[PDB]
Amino acid sequence: IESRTVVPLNTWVLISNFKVAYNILRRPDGTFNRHLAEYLDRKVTANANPVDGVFSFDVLIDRRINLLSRVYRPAYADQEQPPSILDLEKPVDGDIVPVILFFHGGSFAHSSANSAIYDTLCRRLVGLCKCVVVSVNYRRAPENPYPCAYDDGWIALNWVNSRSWLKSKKDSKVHIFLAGDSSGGNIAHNVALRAGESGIDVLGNILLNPMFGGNERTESEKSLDGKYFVTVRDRDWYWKAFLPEGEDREHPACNPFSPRGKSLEGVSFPKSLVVVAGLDLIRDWQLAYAEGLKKAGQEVKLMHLEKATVGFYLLPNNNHFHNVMDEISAFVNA
Amino acid sequence: KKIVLKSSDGESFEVEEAVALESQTIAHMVEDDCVDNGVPLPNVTSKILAKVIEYCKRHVEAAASKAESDDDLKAWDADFMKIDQATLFELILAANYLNIKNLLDLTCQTVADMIKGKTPEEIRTTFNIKNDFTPEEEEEVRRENQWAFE
Amino acid sequence: NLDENLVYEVLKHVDAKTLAMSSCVSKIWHKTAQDERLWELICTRHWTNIGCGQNQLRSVVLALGGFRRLHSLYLWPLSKPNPRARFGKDELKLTLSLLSIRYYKKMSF
Amino acid sequence: MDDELLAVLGYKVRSSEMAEVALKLEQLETMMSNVQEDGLSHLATDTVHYNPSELYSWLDNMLSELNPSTRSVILVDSQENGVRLVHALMACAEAIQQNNLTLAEALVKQIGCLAVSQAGAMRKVATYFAEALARRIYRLTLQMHFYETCPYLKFAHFTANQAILEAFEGKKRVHVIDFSMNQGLQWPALMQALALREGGPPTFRLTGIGPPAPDNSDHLHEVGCKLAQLAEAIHVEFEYRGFVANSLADLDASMLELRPSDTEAVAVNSVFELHKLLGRPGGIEKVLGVVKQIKPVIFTVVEQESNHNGPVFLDRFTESLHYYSTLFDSLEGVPNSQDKVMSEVYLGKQICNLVACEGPDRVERHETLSQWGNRFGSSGLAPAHLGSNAFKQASMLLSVFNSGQGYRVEESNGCLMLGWHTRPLITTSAWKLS
């Protein structure tokens, strides 16, 4: 009953249907019902013809592990006819052109890059931010556990940086921003960490409702348990099906600010935008993550939304949507 | 009731009637009579008959008590399988000649467990047996089972 | 100096891969390995709630070829990724369709 | 109408039934929480779902059971001088469309010269296309290998048996009309499935129609004899009938000796053969009308998702080129063999005929889901929503070869598509009388 008062009806129905679907796809043993999940999933296809100023196409970047990347960009002003296959990868026009490398959510278990809920989000990102967007399709646990996701992210980052038609006039370099949501926030953080001590320079990070955790139950898990379409049972199943068997939640991929994790002080890290929904079950961890950055000496602007829940960036019928979009547009075009 | 069993050698074993009815063959011969004077055994060694009798005895006793537990039984079975090769062999022949299904399952399970995760060059070493296949037949059977070698 | 019946009694309780390995040790063991009952038991190990008789299905499978060619052609590669997985009704339908199609492929006019 | 937001999201929910859907979701949730793991296992493996986009119907079904254009382009990485080849091909098409012969000839020569150093799939696609344009300038076993080297026919056939079986449960006499007997490699599985059923294996009648034998032989007789022998070897009643005809426009409703609809069920099958009728004016319409007159319980259609019936020749060239280049790219991993070579030759011939034969001779005139559905909707045919079962079957099929990679089944609007990742290639669907 409380959930029907904080969100509109359409977001409520969408999130409730997702919650029910992923309830019936869970399994206590640890196995995951892949075929029924892919059946119940709603996907889309690339379309080279412009649609409100945004076309797109698939790129098979890696063949050994079927690593695909869906690229989006604005429609061409100087071309009245639809872009041909040859014209799809023409170099961009403008002094500075940002490239947002995006990772979608789904607790390493649901959705895909060509899923519609994320296709629409990437199209809106391209429209409002006015820049190129590359969506990576990493592999999904539990069939393929740690660390295949960070490797897929790193390979896609290398491919994006190694391109030529995606460059800048002023410095002949690529202006890459890493972005993600839910599990994609964790993937973006880890790939940015890897790039920090590799050579590739990253401009910034855009973490949306990141997924961090630990062993000690914080003070927002008890009360919020089963209130805003998020429980703790699932929070353990997803972490158990991802980390290697015989490991706790203090692993570094689950908690970077752990005694076994390397300190962020003394290493290079870029600026980042941490968006935190106040009414989500995981509100004490995301904020703690920001504080770990704050004491580590790195720049971070915290955006605590006191009346937002999970999935607040899927429909435009609320006020938080416009706000977040404006902040990202001012943080990418700064 | 007490039943006298006579081994082939000539040792005599006193058994509980109940224990004897665990063997359906002995029970069947008892209903057919001609067994009150004594039940001899043509091919059965006294030592193996003694080991089987202890097994059935313990089992029957445990069962009766429970009706009036599984962990203790399992422990006893594991402790009674601490022998060598040829004794297990005499026991399987005796179990077959007397038809005591539970002991047969235990002995067949132990043999299956020792030959678990073994290859053609291992089982042969364990049993010292002769491979009598010709090169063509051996390659054909190997090719039929090649999926098992990957 | 083992006989035949006892070899079957011992091998009734062995796993598939081990029985396949044991089929190449000696002659008596090789002969005992093709008895369709052992492979029938190994194939119907996880078949819960099938929907037809175990005799009818046995008749059809024996008509189409057997069980040694049904678990070492389609069931194996299909179970290679995830070993610990019970086989439902879909596995039976798919494997039997492939087996019947193969029998048709080998059939002579 | 339909909610804009949800519609672009990927769901079909009426604006007057939102509250109802929400209430149903709440009840379903409470009921699922009340039951234990068994309830979930039951909905995981036992039940089936049809058309998930319709949230209302789907939820209703769940409740009752618990408590009884768009052009896809995939740029590959293997491309170092590919632009020179594509450019040359386009130039050849443009010169052919502008009336200039000398230009086209020179262009073709150049294409061959630049195609002699290219490797991978580009070499085969460019060579076959160059041959096709040479044929154009001049006029101005294969199937078995393909079936044993590609999953297209196998996936189509299995999905078709699943649909017919799901439309034949609880019936007695089943008649099947096939518009393409070919080798009859689909019927075995259907026959066994109809045998190992619950209630008894019913009588099976089959009437297959095929193209006139080119060598004056008897192939339908061999298929019928083989099917009857395997039938007996499986213990099921079976009647066979073979037919020889050129196209599908000559087929009639009387020339098929049908029984009363009230005492039998008829099912029509088609696997890549409907797109051959579009060339005769009035054909497709006549066949659709006769099918309607036949009043069947299911009509299975398998087709290629591509628009090649476009008037402009340039568009056809471009589309076909990209579609066949991605198709050839999808067979570069399998090792060198004989089936692969045979299939490549078959594809090449197909491409050549498409870019060399015009008028009625051209039979390879494909269309997409939307067009086909509009053609079917003008005659009185409604869709037939496939379920999760067919999806799972196809999944397993692809997982048997090459550890299930590359080809991916996607369900969209009640139809299945097998495609190279996100590029739909084969679209299977079923229809019935509205």
Ligand SMILES: C=C1C[C@]23C[C@@]1(O)CC[C@H]2[C@@]12C=C[C@H](O)[C@@](C)(C(=O)O1)[C@H]2[C@@H]3C(=O)O
């Ligand atoms: C089991 C889960 C996982 C959810 C929350 C939920 O409780 C309900 C469904 C998931 C989810 C679905 C899509 C979005 O990616 C997400 C962030 C959301 O809002 O809801 C997704 C979110 C997540 O991936 O964390």
